[PDB]
Structure formats: structure tokens, C-alpha cells
């Protein structure tokens with residue numbers, strides 16, 4: 070403690086006197102910290118919040134500043150611990166509320182996935198987001214981010230050149246084999262031990278490991294697919310396909326690599342169920358619960374047959390574990406209170422479930438209460454079946470799970486035929502986002518491209534009928550002479566010939582057909598050919614190239630618009646850069662300290678996870694207003710600096 | 715070093731013409747249109763390689779009697795019988811052919827494969843040298859803007 | 860239109876197959892792919 | 908050019924009023940001011 074030289078002589082002697090020194094000159098630093106740090110942390114945080122409030126609300130006070138200067142030593146400890154939100158409390162009053170931000174929350178906020186999600190949310194709310202629902206979208210994004218952060222926290226050289234290129238990857242193959250051996254043999258003595266406690270605590274750990282490493286094994290599967298497809302470049306025909314292109318050591322490694330790829334694909338499809346299924350289930354439950362509470366979907370506004378989501382979300386509202394992932398349970402009671410007198414007192418509860426359960430609870434509120442017993446190997450009756458089946462239906466409807474199912478199916482078929490592994494190269498497009506900047510230039514228009522090819526087909530069809538009617542003696546692609554075939558004698562044959570030859574010929578259709586020297590048709594067929602060239606492969610491929618090029622510019626313009634809006638406006642109050650740019654570095658300080666989106670998200674987390682009973686006045690106000698989902702507590706066009714001097 | 719080697723072989727002085735690019739800034743306005751994206755261009759060529767590889771395996775599995783570039787007749791060679799040979803043939807001929815890959819291979823008149831190989835060829839043309847060179851040209855053009 | 864390999868003998872001679880393939884494909888990709896695209900891009904950018 | 912025309916139309920209709928042409932900034936002092944002005948006070952449908 071004296072080598073650090075943070076503590077002076079007085080402090081060191083004080084702590085040495087405060088030591089236990091219980092007749093052994095030995096102290097338990099664990100219990101010492103446990104008794105002398107946590108209450109100190111709590112009271113110090115409260116004092117820091119009080120001093121920060123006094124400083125921010127009592128400016129230009131030298132008497133307060135002199136105290137703050139000596140108080141700075143402890144005030145800096147809680148600097149990355151206290152948030153600050155500017156809300157609208159009393160009528161026309163921008164109140165600055167303070168709260169605590171947990172280290173776990175701040176750690177999970179800086180994860181790259183969360184940052185990318187926030188960037189995408191900002192992008193697609195600036196571009197196509199509205200104004201009446203900006204705070205709606207922001208609160209939805211905040212709720213999803215809080216749920217996912219909690220989930221994450223709770224967890225001869227033409228042939229030999231390629232041979233030489235792959236021979237350098239044995240150094241990676243051997244370490245992959247060592248990694249899989251440390252699991253199949255080094256972990257076997259633990260995974261095959263010899264009860265329920267020690268098996269559940271292990272299966273939960275394994276599921277958490279898969280959820281943690283879901284993406285890393287996606288990369289691993291991609292690399293294994295590349296290796297398989299590279300070693301597939303050594304095949305020869307003899308009706309029989311043979312891999313005889315090296316000095317052995319490839320025929321068995323291909324099979325073991327295919328087996329490894331299938332195993333990794335299965336582990337990916339089971340890790341997705343642990344990582345991303347809870348998030349989509351949370352979103353679905355939140356959506357259906359809010360529809361029930363604020364719209365009376367299955368009460369007054371029965372969903373139509375157009376949407377399957379509404380129909381499939383009908384057999385979930387009547388189960389007991391309905392809000393399994395919504396961090397609240399007072400939704401059935403809320404809707405019962407809202408529609409219990411306007412509609413059937415029992416007719417609401419019969420289709421919301423727990424009707425007999427409500428009657429039993431009312432009866433048991435009297436002097437009638439037994440003790441429930443728990444029996445091992447007898448939880449199949451305890452677990453819900455209807456809710457699980459609804460969840461399975463939602464999962465199998467989910468698109469991202471279907472992609473992994475198709476991936477697994479192709480991997481399985483790769484064993485039957487050792488070429489379906491080529492279909493796994495499509496994961497670089499349908500999967501990772503490293504090629505999105507290029508594939509977006511094609512998929513941005515999309516409909517325009519297919520409309521262009523349809524127009525091309527129609528124009529070629531018109532030219533085809535014109536050729537069929539007026540040009541007989543020209544479509545005479547005969548080989549060696551006196552063997553006329555592949556002619557214009559059939560209408561569909563001519564259409565196929567046009568679409569397949571004239572479009573790709575590069576020089577129209579006149580470069581693949583006889584010389585137009587026959588009388589009375591020279592100029593007519595010259596016009597025909599030159600117009601084909603100028604209309605089909607001059608201003609119809611130029612249209613496709615123009616669509617592709619314009620997609621790049623449109624995406625760049627969208628990105629520039631997002632950057633412009635986020636640099637010259639505030640996301641929450643939307644006042645403007647110029648007003649805040651009067652104090653040196655004003656706008657950046659306003660967007661980093663006063664109106665921080667991360668701070669607002671942390672405040673929402675604090676309200677949700679703190680409690681219901683000991684909210685302060687501002688916390689209770691904001692909580693009630695968030696529960697009723699109206700949101701004028703978000704500063705609309707005002708801030709603290711506009712409110713005061 | 716190149717100047718010194720030019721004395722040993724009087725042709726390494728051709729490597730000094732690269733100083734107009736790596737040196738003086740008179741050509742920066744033009745070379746920036748290529749080097750501004752850069753990573754996008756190599757990603758595009760990688761995607762082109764992957765698409766041509768997929769088409770190569772499809773051709774290897776389903777089109778045997780077509781890759782028959784025999785000269786003077788009865789001398790079959792340069793075929794699709796080898797997977798890497800077919801991939802090399804595709805990358806080296808179909809990409810640069812200007813008319814897809816159907817303009818360098820036999821006429822698809824064989825029964826039960828006419829429409830299938832027509833679809834194969836037209837899709838090669840429309841995906842590889844229509845909207846994949848257009849992507850490269852669009853990157854080059856967008857760099858200017 | 861197809862580089863320089865479409866006007867010259869087939870690169871089947873030993874010890875030069877891959878080298879001349881690289882030569883031809885690089886000619887195609889550098890001279891008539893991103894060097895005529897530069898001219899077309901200049902023409903198009905002038906309009907804008 | 909067509910994309911620029913569409914963007915210009917959207918820009919004008921989002922930062923100006925069709926009738927009085929005052930501007931977005933003046934009305935954006937009351938919460939949701941410009942939208943209320945363009946939906947209730949100076950509605951083209953209302954004038955028709």
C-alpha cells in the first residue's frame with residue numbers, strides 16, 4: 070500500500086489501525102473489502118449525484134466551486150457511473166434527472182454488434198423513418214437493445230500450383246485437428262462422467278458456449294466450405310468420378326472435412342436457437358401484447374386472413390406463460406381492466422386463459438393454501454406445451470432459421486454427392502455482410518432490372534414476328550451446304566434464336582445471318598439490323614448499366630444524408646447545430662452529455678430493472694408515461710440551455 | 715536497383731515508366747478513379763470467380779458432350795473432363811468471349827438439354843458479363859463523382 | 860474486344876500455360892476493362 | 908436527372924409550405940408544428 074504512494078502516512082496508519090489484527094497478523098482482504106467498500110460505494114455515489122446536481126443547477130458560485138475542487142477526487146470515480154437525462158416533467162420545465170449506469174450495462178453497450186445495430190437503426194430511421202413515430206422507433210430499438218444486452222450479459226505447373234498452394238494449409242489443418250481432438254478426446258473424460266443438478270448445470274454451460282461462439286463457427290464453416298471446394302478442383306472423369314491428382318492424403322481428408330462441416334453446421338443451427346431465437350420471440354411477444362393492450366386485436370379488431378402472423382398469434386394469448394420474454398407480466402391484468410366492463414367479465418378471461426386459475430386464486434386467498442411439491446424426472450407435465458408449440462411455429466416461420474436449415478440440408482446432401490458443398494459458397498452473399506456494398510448496387514433497383522429484361526423480351530419478340538413475316542431466305546444457318554436447318558420456319562424457334570444469339574452477338578443480329586444483298590430487301594433489312602443493334606444492345610444494356618451505376622450513387626447519397634443529419638441536428642430535440650455552436654464545442658458537448666442516446670437507453674434500463682415501489686418522483690412520472698406510451702417527456706424542441714441562461 | 719539491373723539486361727528500364735504513376739501527380743485525377751474503391755474491385759473479381767466456379771461445377775456435372783474443342787475432327791481435347799481444366803477454360807474464355815460462353819461451345823441441339831443449356835448460356839451472359847462488368851464500370855464511374 | 864489472347868495461338872505449351880493465361884487475363888482486365896471504363900466514366904462525369 | 912427532380916420535389920414539400928411558403932424552421936418551434944400547419948391550417952385538400 071505504500072509502494073503505490075496513493076495513500077499518505079496518515080492514511081496508511083489509519084488503515085493499519087482499521088485492520089483486523091486478530092492475534093495472528095493476518096487479515097482476510099475479501100471480507101475487508103466486503104465490509105468497507107460497498108456501503109462506501111453507495112453513499113459516495115449518492116453524494117456524487119447530489120454534488121453534480123448542485124454544480125449543474127448552481128453555476129457561477131465560487132463558494133460551491135471551492136468545495137467541488139477538493140471534492141473532485143471522489144467525484145471522478147463515479148464519472149463513468151452516473152447518467153443525466155433532460156426530460157419534460159412539470160408543465161414547461163426541462164428537468165435534469167440523474168441515475169446510475171451499471172458497469173455491466175456500459176460493457177455490453179460497447180460490443181461491436183450493439184454498435185453496428187445502433188448505426189443501422191440511425192441510418193434507417195434517418196432515411197425512411199418518419200417524424201410522428203421517431204420516438205416510437207427509438208423506444209422500440211432501446212427495448213430490443215436492452216433485451217439483447219441482458220441476454221449477452223447473462224451468458225509442369227498447370228496442375229501442381231494449386232497443390233502447392235494447398236500444401237501450405239496443412240499447418241492450419243493440423244491445428245484444427247488438435248482443436249477438435251481436445252474436444253473429442255480431451256473433454257470426453259468430463260462429458261461422459263459416470264445427478265440432475267450436475268447434468269443441467271453442464272447442458273446450460275454448453276448451450277451458453279454455443280450461443281457465445283455462434284458467429285466464430287459461422288466463419289469456421291465458411292472456411293471449411295472453401296477448403297472443400299478448393300480440394301474439389303481435383304476431379305477427373307473415367308461415368309466414374311475419381312480424385313487421383315496427388316501423392317495421397319487427400320481422399321480421406323475430403324471425407325473427414327465433409328463430416329466436420331456437417332457437424333459444424335448442426336452446431337450452428339443449434340446455437341442460433343440459443344442466441345437469436347430469444348430476441349425474435351421477445352419482439353413477437355412485445356408486438357402481440359401491445360396490440361392486445363392498445364388495439365384490442367383479439368377482442369374488438371379480429372385479424373383478417375391476409376396475415377398469418379395475426380392468426381398464429383391467437384393460440385399464444387391464452388397460455389399461462391404468455392409474456393415469457395417481455396420483462397413484465399401485468400399485461401393480461403392490464404387488458405382485463407381495460408376491457409372487463411366494456412366487454413364480458415368472464416368472456417375476456419376465457420379467451421385470455423387463467424379463468425379457472427383466477428377463480429382458484431380468489432378462492433385460495435382465504436384460509437386454503439397447500440404446499441406444492443417438486444418431483445425429479447416429472448417436469449414434462451409442468452412445462453407448457455401450447456406455448457412451446459407456438460414458439461416452434463414462430464421459429465420455423467423465421468427466415469434466418471430457414472436459411473440455416475437449408476444450409477444443413479445441403480451439407481447433408483453433400484455426403485450423398487460430394488458437389489452440393491458448392492452451394493455453400495452462396496453463404497458469402499446470403500450470409501456475411503462483407504459483400505453488401507457490391508450486392509446492394511444490384512439489389513437496390515431489382516424490380517427495374519426484371520422490368521428491363523421483360524421489355525427486352527417484348528422488343529425481341531416484336532422483331533421476331535417482323536423477321537418471321539418478312540425475312541424467309543436469311544435464317545439459313547446451314548453447315549457444309551445443302552443442309553438447311555435452325556431456320557425461321559418456326560415462330561418459337563425464331564424467337565429462341567433471336568433471344569439466344571442476337572442479344573449476345575455484340576453486333577446486333579446482322580453479323581450471324583446472310584448478307585442482305587437480295588433485291589427489294591437490301592435497305593429494309595439494313596434498317597432492321599441497324600435498329601436491332603441500336604435498340605437492343607445499345608440503349609437496352611445501357612439501361613441496365615445505368616441502373617447499376619445509379620444504385621451506387623443513391624446509396625452514397627443516403628449515407629451522406631445520414632452523416633449530414635447527424636452532424637447538423639440533434640437526434641432527440643432537433644434544435645440545430647448553429648444554436649449550440651455559440652459556446653466553444655457546444656453541439657458536441659450537447660450531443661455527448663445532455664442528450665445522449667446511450668444515456669436515454671441506460672435510463673430506460675434503470676427504470677425497467679430497478680423496481681416498481683421505490684421510484685422517485687421523476688422516475689415514477691416517466692415510468693407511468695412510458696407504461697401508457699405517450700412520450701412528451703422526450704424534449705421535443707427545447708433543452709436546458711434554451712430553458713435557462 | 716532497377717536502373718542497376720538495366721545495365722545487365724537492357725530492358726528493366728521499362729520498369730521506370732511506372733514512375734509516371736507511382737511518382738508525379740499529373741495522373742492522380744485518373745488513377746484515383748481506380749484506387750478510390752480498390753477493395754470493391756477485388757471483391758467484385760472474387761465474386762466473379764465464385765460465380766464462374768458455380769457455373770463450372772454445373773457444367774461439369776450436366777454438360778459432357780459440349781466442351782469438345784477439337785481441331786480437324788476426331789482429336790478431342792481441352793474438354794470438361796477435368797474440373798480444374800473446366801474452371802480454367804471458363805475463367806479464360808467465357809469471361810472474355812463477349813457473348814457469354816455459348817459462342818465458344820457446340821450448338822445446343824441435343825435432345826433433353828436444349829432449353830436447359832439455353833438457360834445456362836443466357837444466364838451466364840446476363841450475370842457474368844452484363845451485371846458483373848457493369849458493377850466494375852459503375853465503381854469506376856462513381857469514384858469520379 | 861477479348862484482350863490479346865483471342866488473336867494468338869492457344870497457350871498449351873509447357874512451362875508457359877499459367878504464365879500466359881495470367882498475361883492474357885491481366886491484359887483483358889487492365890486494358891479493355893478498367894481503361895475504357897475510365898474513358899466512359901470521364902464522358903459520363905462531364906454530363907453530370 | 909429524374910432522381911434529382913424527385914428529390915427536389917420531396918425537399919421542397921418537406922421544408923416549405925405550398926401556400927404561404929414560410930419555412931420549416933419557423934413552424935418547428937411548437938412540438939410537431941410544421942406537420943400540424945400543413946395538415947390543419949393550410950391543407951390543399953381543405954382549400955379544394
Ligand SMILES: [Zn+2]
Pocket residue numbers: 639640641642643644659664708
Ligand atoms: Zn438535443
Ligand SMILES: [Zn+2]
Pocket residue numbers: 924925926927928929944949
Ligand atoms: Zn402555410
